[PDB]
Design a protein around this ligand. Structure first.
Ligand SMILES: O=C(O)c1ccc(Nc2ncc3c(n2)-c2ccc(Cl)cc2C(c2c(F)cccc2F)=NC3)cc1
Length: 256
């Protein structure tokens, strides 16, 4: 695999630590997304074990709702990451443009996530980094999990918003950590922003540690219940996916 097997299209993103361009595999005209990385910024951060370890995990996962990593290859000074391309764009931007999502749209995204996660929780992998900007949209408008920068094996410093008390209180945690994010996320899908939002890192900790959230009046009781069930402080109180997938509100509003 050489960078000359591909035809770079329009840029879709920037980082940290390279760029993501549209691209067409020359011989098969196969459309995809290609992530670039400079070995320079790589060792300058030393996170090379992660890249190898993250690419490691993602490369061995199969799900309609999990963005696929076909392959990769490095050259003179670059690292190349051959990724599945998501036509409809990023869920984050969408939320930005619409402000929030009606119950039907929210309820379905959750159902798709629940499966993708139910799946990960059986391959013994925990995402832990579920957040809008980690979600993209398939051409059919369906949800796709994109990043694995953290996702680890278990039972086992950035944005504190989607992390549960255990993660934050440096405590011992497991697969139920993702069920807390699903709650937070659900809330954001419906409210327009996270439950434990704060102008300061410090005070978010407090809001999250003490599980302090309230709903806007417009939030329906069907939702409030689910979210509340999902945002239980004690990881054991956190329901299990099946139950989530089979919650009244979920069923009464989902497409799947
Ligand atoms: O603006 C539009 O109209 C638009 C934007 C994007 C798409 N599609 C798309 N499909 C697949 C990927 C990406 N984007 C993508 C794009 C940019 C960047 Cl900075 C990262 C990635 C990723 C990614 C990743 F590796 C880690 C974490 C998150 C990721 F999102 N990986 C594949 C369609 C339309």
């Amino acid at each position: 695999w050489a960078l000359e097997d591909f035809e770079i299209g329009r840029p879709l993103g920037k980082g940290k630590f390279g760029n993501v361009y549209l691209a067409r595999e020359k011989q098969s005209k196969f459309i995809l997304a290609l992530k670039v990385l400079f070995k320079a910024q790589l060792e300058k951060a030393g996170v090379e074990h992660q890249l190898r370890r993250e690419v490691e995990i993602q490369s061995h996962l199969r799900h309609p709702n999990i963005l696929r990593l076909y392959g990769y290859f490095h050259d003179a000074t670059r690292v190349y990451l051959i990724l599945e391309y998501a036509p409809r764009g990023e869920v984050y931007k969408e939320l930005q443009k619409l402000s929030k999502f009606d119950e039907q749209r929210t309820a379905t995204y959750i159902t798709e996530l629940a499966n993708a996660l139910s799946y990960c929780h059986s391959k013994r992998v925990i995402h832990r980094d579920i957040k809008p900007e980690n979600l993209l949209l398939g051409s059919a408008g369906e949800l796709k999990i994109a990043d694995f920068g953290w996702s680890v094996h278990a039972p086992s410093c950035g944005t504190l918003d989607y992390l549960p008390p255990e993660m934050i209180e440096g405590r011992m945690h497991d697969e139920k950590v993702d069920l807390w994010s699903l709650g937070v996320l659900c809330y954001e899908f419906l409210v327009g922003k996270p439950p434990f939002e704060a102008n300061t890192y410090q005070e978010t900790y407090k809001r999250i540690s003490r599980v302090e959230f309230t709903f806007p009046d417009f939030v329906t009781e069907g939702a409030r219940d689910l979210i509340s069930r999902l945002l239980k402080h004690n990881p054991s109180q956190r329901p299990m996916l099946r139950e989530v997938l089979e919650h009244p509100w979920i069923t009464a509003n989902s497409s799947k």
